[PDB]
Amino acid sequence: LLQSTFSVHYLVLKDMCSSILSLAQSLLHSLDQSIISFGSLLYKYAFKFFDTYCQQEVVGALVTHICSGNEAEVDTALDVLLELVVLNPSAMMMNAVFVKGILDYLDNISPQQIRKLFYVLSTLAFSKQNEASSHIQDDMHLVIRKQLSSTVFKYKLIGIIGAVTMAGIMAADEQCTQVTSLLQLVHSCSEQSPQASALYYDEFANLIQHEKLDPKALEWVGQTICNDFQDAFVVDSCVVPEGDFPFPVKALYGLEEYDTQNGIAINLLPLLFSQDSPLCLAPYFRLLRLCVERQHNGNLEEIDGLLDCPIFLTDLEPGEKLESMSAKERSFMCSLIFLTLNWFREIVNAFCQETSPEMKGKVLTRLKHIVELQIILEKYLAVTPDYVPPLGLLLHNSHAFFRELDIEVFSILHCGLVTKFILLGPPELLFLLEDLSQKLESMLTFSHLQQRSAQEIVHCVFQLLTPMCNHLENIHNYFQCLKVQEYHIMSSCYQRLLQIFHGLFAWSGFSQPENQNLLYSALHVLSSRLKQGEHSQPLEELLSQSVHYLQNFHQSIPSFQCALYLIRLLMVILEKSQNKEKIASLARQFLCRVWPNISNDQLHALLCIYLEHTESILKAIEEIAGVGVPELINSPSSTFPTLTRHTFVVFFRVMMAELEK
Amino acid sequence: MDQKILSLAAEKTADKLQEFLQTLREGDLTNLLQNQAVKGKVAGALLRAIFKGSPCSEEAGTLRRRKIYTCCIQLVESGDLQKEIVSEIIGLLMLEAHHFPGPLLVELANEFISAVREGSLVNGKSLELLPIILTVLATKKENLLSGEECKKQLINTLCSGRWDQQYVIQLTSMFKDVPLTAEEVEFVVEKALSMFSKMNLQEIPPLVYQLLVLSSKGSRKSVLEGIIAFFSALDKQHNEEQSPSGELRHVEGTIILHIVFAIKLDYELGRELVKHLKVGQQGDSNNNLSPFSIALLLSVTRIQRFQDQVLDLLKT
Amino acid sequence: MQIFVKTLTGKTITLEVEPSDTIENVKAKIQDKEGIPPDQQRLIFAGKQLEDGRTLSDYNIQKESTLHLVLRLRGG
Hints:
The structure is cut from a larger assembly and holds chains A, B and C.
Chain A: H1 2-8, H2 10-13, H3 17-28, H4 33-49, H5 52-68, H6 71-87, H7 89-94, H8 96-100, H9 111-125, H10 135-148, H11 153-170, H12 174-189, H13 194-210, H14 215-232, E1 234-235, E2 250-252, E3 265-266, H15 268-275, H16 281-296, E4 311-313, H17 328-351, H18 357-383, H19 394-401, H20 426-444, H21 454-464, H22 466-481, H23 484-505, H24 516-526, H25 539-551, H26 560-574, H27 580-592, H28 600-613, H29 617-624, H30 630-633, H31 648-660
Antiparallel strand pairs in A: 1-3, 2-4
Helix pairs in contact in A: 1-4, 3-4, 3-5, 4-5, 4-6, 5-6, 6-9, 9-11, 10-11, 11-12, 11-13, 13-16, 14-16, 16-17, 17-18, 20-23, 21-22, 22-23, 23-26, 24-25, 25-26, 26-27, 26-28, 27-28, 28-31
Chain B: H1 8-11, H2 17-24, H3 30-33, H4 35-38, H5 41-50, H6 59-78, H7 83-95, H8 102-117, H9 129-138, H10 147-160, H11 168-175, H12 182-194, H13 204-215, H14 221-242, H15 245-263, H16 267-276, H17 293-300, H18 307-315
Helix pairs in contact in B: 5-7, 6-8, 8-10, 10-12, 11-13, 12-14, 13-15, 15-17, 17-18
Chain C: E1 2-7, E2 12-16, H1 23-34, E3 41-44, E4 66-71
Parallel strand pairs in C: 1-4
Antiparallel strand pairs in C: 1-2, 3-4
């Protein structure tokens, strides 16, 4: 309607510029993104069709929304400015001083919106026909060199962000010298602060990864970055390092299938002790990796000796024999294992895409190294309570402090299990499934994940989950159909598998028809897990087949949480379609089992799943309230267990709430 | 005598420079005031040869470092030197304050607090060392009382004693760069609000500006309460004198404009201003507003986000 | 005639200006005697921000009046 209105009735509405923009301003202030869509499109069409004065008033209103409004308002107005500069740069070039006016308020804007603001300004500046209007081009160069020349970290952050995004947009022979000067100056001013240099490496890595830009500049920068990396950390593999250390410093965690009389080694611990530049190892390797992937089209034959190297480390592996000599050596050790795991995570991020089988064996050895150093680090944090290094309690360290893996690292997940007790191990699978669950939870209900769209992640997981985690599901059913710690691990892997299943199938882009084709292929994995041959079947037949496959896991389930996840998965599948008796019978079975404790919220959720789906709520309540009585008579624990003296409160609360409802 | 130190900082370190300090041993006051009088360039180059020549690993270098710091703090206050060489020597004192042990900085800070007690501070560039040292005291968590407790007693000695009336605003410019706790910013703003009475009026607005950039990292309610209550009291004095306008109304308008332009950069300050001057229950509105706070609100009405809330507050 | 200009660090500078001179002339005098760039300068008198195109006679600035100078650093 709005396109037809503003395309036909543009001469009539040209009177009422101010009323239209007042309505747009009143609509942008609210929630409900369908409203804010209309608030954006009103500005868009008003800029599209009206006169130059109304265009100036539109830009004024947008800068008013940015400089004043809240996060949704700033986001929407910046999206609108991006759409208008990509639509009409020549119209915005008349009003570009008003867009320059946002540089007064950089102390009020979030760093993501700083990225977006610098992007829109620097794509406005660097159109080819507007090189007669070079005033903005010199002015923003000036303000970047001004921002970078401050000692304060909050200004240096904005300077680094603006420098990287500006170099990225201007890098699509003298322009090569220009980006050379800019990158050299940001590298020179960002050299001294470690936190600034880390952010610089991260931003430059994100730029090289996300954007395809003019490979002559990449060819220029790669010879710089590779050489600075190979002289920065890489030393000779002589067994005695420099530095008077009170520690048996060795070259640990080699692969030992590589040639041990090689030159490439890593001077990590002497650099870390000479610090007290080693905190910038992982992002710099990410940068080098990305430059080589963009140059040689993913061929890492220049690097692939680097995952063979040991690391010059203290003998870490016992953290019990050196107990109660608590000192700064504990902080040294915990930060050492921290940097080791970050480096190993970046290696695993690097060489997961490669298809060579011995490289996959090396990456699996790196994963075993990751999980064993994770055990040593959690032991070190167990003995040393509060001395935590913040480098940009286990729940805190799990998500934010470590490096974030890619999505293609779960291409490891195609390899099968080798259970060590019955005869890719269990705990590395636990690690991978924990990571994938923690990603899907944040994405569908984490920086490099969020530049990928949720549709892209759901699309990519469909290949990357179902036909190789169904194998692990079958292996888990086989194991639990048949010493304590491996059971503890494999129970957690089973829980995480069902969690990832539920998080995938409960995705809220399946009401839309465009993703439903993907959903059909999803059912084509689940229906074809028992028997094939029935192809191009109706949707409800695939649903019945999938739930019939999913139902017979119920005897193998070793804990309450996996049962709850299974019933929520069955419910969120069966709602795509009588089945209330199925859900009720399953819930009743899981309420009736022994469960060798159980948190009250799990049992609350299972009881509200049971009572809403039964045939009669009233006779169900009368059933449980002729069981609530023989809990007192017989047991000093009932004939309907998980109804202890503790869990009576939860049973009562659910019964009262559900009777009232 | 300058040409026999430039050959000492060039070849090697500590083997020849450490004996030159103990052999001279007479005076470091006449040898720094008079070489600047002919050519000021020979002093900044001398400092990178004495300071590189006196590390903090040994004690006799540390005492010489304390001595050279004391005599260069005295000369930048005493001498009517050029602003260029002053900026250079303050720059070298900025670049060479990173690696100090505990007990020397507290004595240098004692000389600093002694200067804020009595001494004629014609240039506040001498107290520019006082920001950064309270940072480097805080990073040393070891008994010199730890660093933070010595920092607390230091700020207490600054706040408790009388503030030198000509340069009170200058000391307020020093707490902007130091990190403080909530109790520390609360103490420094209650001292800064206590010092409003014993001044001329027209230095109050930029000191208010020096408060607001401090108020961005601490308590804003105390600063706003003190400013509003103080100028409301002065308005009451002017009205009972009426029953003195052409400066008091001017300084009021200037302060209003300053804190509106500070609210323009810090919306948390604006939201706490709207909260503080709320009517709410009918008993607060018989003490809240004033002929100064109403003008302040009607100037806040210039800011686009605060147009609705402030006019709805004044209407109700 | 004589006026005072007080800045944020409490430094007070005496200016010899005629009321016929414009405001950017005063900013040029601050540039000469203090080195502060005129685009960063912002002048306040009696709670009024001075505009560039006016003079002292538009804002009723008489003898021994006090101006307030603040430094408007765009980004930092």
